[PDB]
From Swiss-Prot:
Domain of life (superkingdom): Bacteria
Chain spans, region Alpha C-terminal domain (alpha-CTD): 1-75
Record note on domains: The N-terminal domain is essential for RNAP assembly and basal transcription, whereas the C-terminal domain is involved in interaction with transcriptional regulators and with upstream promoter elements.
Gene: rpoA
Homology family: Belongs to the RNA polymerase alpha chain family.
Subunit structure as annotated in this protein's UniProt entry: Homodimer. The RNAP catalytic core consists of 2 alpha, 1 beta, 1 beta' and 1 omega subunit. When a sigma factor is associated with the core the holoenzyme is formed, which can initiate transcription.
Transmembrane segments: none
Protein name as annotated: DNA-directed RNA polymerase subunit alpha
Function text: DNA-dependent RNA polymerase catalyzes the transcription of DNA into RNA using the four ribonucleoside triphosphates as substrates.
DNA sequence: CGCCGCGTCAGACTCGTAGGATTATAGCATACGTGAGGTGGGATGTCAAGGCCTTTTTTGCCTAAAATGTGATCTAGATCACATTTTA
């Protein structure tokens, strides 16, 4: 999709969550959605609420978590 | 009074078309200011690490306390080929 290929700062993320993302080598939103929730919760600084509001904003702009890709990355 | 001469003053309306100018003019010296150039220097703006507080993420922990396991003893369901037997 045209929205697979965006950096996450178009979502206007937060500093703690941003540190969580850059800390975990998660580059593309296609790389985001291929990651699973429990693969996030165990990670540093990602407990209750990061998952809450990131779930909110992805509920806003029409996508969800944990989805599955194929032919990734086209780069 | 009544010419005559001279002078003043208007001459329809909307569109289109082209580019366009020219002569010759003394010369050098003095001395002064202003434009374009340097130039250190306050001062502002940036970028990378640290101390105040609350919130957040782990994470102790606290005791109610319901749940998860132990296994031998049963139980009330469940079958199948033969013998009719009923109903549309």
């Amino acid at each position: 999709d045209p929205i697979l290929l965006r950096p996450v700062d178009d979502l206007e993320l937060t500093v703690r969550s941003a540190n969580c993302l850059k800390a975990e080598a998660i580059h593309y939103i296609g790389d985001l959605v291929q990651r699973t929730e429990v693969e996030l919760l165990k990670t540093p600084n990602l407990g209750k609420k990061s998952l809450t509001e990131i779930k909110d904003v992805l509920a806003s702009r029409g996508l969800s978590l944990g989805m599955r890709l194929e032919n990734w990355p086209p780069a």
